[PDB]
């Protein structure tokens, strides 16, 4: 059992590090033959926060990179969305900025949002200035964080903060 079940979306283009962010999460196995051949879009993790146990079920939707017109698919039916850009690539930052602006418009206030610049450890190759992203995030009232999925730095804190801001809402 658990006390809460939160549903999270992980949005971001290929190559930015979504899979590496989810390394603490586990895949449901399936006695279903059809599933075992293919696999699934989501991973699960139970955590403890403020004396409450929370099951996080997080979607890294397959094929999202193909369909970047922002519909409800990106902002309905989720307690939290985590938007990830590659800190060493300006075009991925320009892309999430655009999408996160569009989500912000339609999204209900109840959906929580977090901007994540990933690959902070590639400091020689780093192109996107955090103070630019930080101020973009501030402009929309959204938290911002830089992470290294490989080193696992600020990854835990990203999910724990997100989980804490949903939990306070409900």
């Amino acid at each position: 059992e658990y006390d809460y079940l939160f549903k999270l979306l992980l949005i971001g283009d290929s190559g930015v590090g979504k899979s590496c962010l989810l390394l603490r999460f586990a895949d449901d196995t399936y006695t279903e033959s059809y599933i075992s051949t293919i696999g699934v879009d989501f991973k699960i993790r139970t955590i403890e926060l403020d004396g409450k146990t929370i099951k996080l079920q997080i979607w890294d939707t397959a094929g999202q990179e193909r369909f970047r017109t922002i519909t409800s698919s990106y902002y309905x039916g989720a307690h939290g969305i985590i938007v990830v850009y590659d800190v060493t690539d300006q075009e991925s930052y320009a892309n999430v900025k655009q999408w996160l602006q569009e989500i912000d418009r339609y999204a209900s206030e109840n959906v929580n949002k977090l901007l994540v610049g990933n690959k902070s450890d590639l400091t020689t190759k780093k192109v996107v200035d955090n103070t630019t992203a930080k101020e973009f995030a501030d402009s929309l009232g959204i938290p911002f964080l830089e992470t290294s999925a490989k080193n696992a730095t600020n990854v835990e804190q990203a999910f724990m903060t997100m989980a804490a801001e949903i939990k306070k809402r409900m």
Partner: protein, 191 residues
């Protein structure tokens, strides 16, 4: 390897051809065939993509994939409830990955789809098509919570069709069907 790849190429054409005709269930099954074959033959997207240089997915195809993507993604998450959160989300999520695999065989990473607006499939029509496919590939012993999977899919298909007949299709009513695990039925379903 040379002839395995060419058999994968034709299986891909078959799925793309199914797509060109708006045959949803037929596209999903052909994509299933392609996936199973490449897994058996140990082929990956990278191996087959060069062979597809001269093939292409139409704007019509990209329109149907987008409808399928949008509907499956919403269904996977709505189906995750306090009753059960793995099998039904898994089944729907696996349909989505299967369709993403078809596109990855053809497309470089982060290449966008160019869908045709006038060929969008309405979300209620895709959902039945997804459930009809799940019904057909689910193991006869598969269960969602306490219900047989095939039987629950029939019940949800009929529920959505009833909403369409009375012209009562909206996100609220659809979410009720997608989140339902048949808790208010009078039987645990079976053969």
């Amino acid at each position: 390897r040379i002839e395995n790849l060419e058999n994968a190429k034709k299986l891909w054409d078959n799925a793309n051809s199914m797509l060109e005709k708006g045959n949803i269930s037929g596209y999903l099954k052909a994509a299933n065939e392609l996936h199973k074959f490449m897994k058996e033959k140990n082929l990956k997207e990278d191996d087959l993509r060069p062979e597809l240089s001269d093939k292409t997915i139409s704007p019509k195809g990209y329109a149907i994939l987008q409808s399928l993507w949008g509907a499956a993604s919403d269904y996977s998450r709505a189906a995750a409830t306090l009753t059960e959160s793995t099998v039904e989300p898994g089944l729907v999520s696996a349909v989505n990955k299967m369709s993403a695999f078809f596109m990855d065989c053809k497309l470089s990473p982060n290449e966008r789809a160019t869908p045709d607006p006038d060929f969008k499939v309405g979300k209620s029509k895709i959902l039945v098509g997804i459930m009809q496919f799940i019904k057909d590939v689910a193991d006869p012993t598969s269960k969602i919570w306490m219900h047989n999977t095939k039987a629950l899919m029939n019940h949800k298909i009929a529920a959505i069709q009833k909403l369409e007949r009375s012209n009562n299709v909206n996100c609220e009513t659809l979410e009720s069907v997608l989140s339902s695990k048949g808790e208010n039925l009078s039987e645990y379903l079976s053969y």
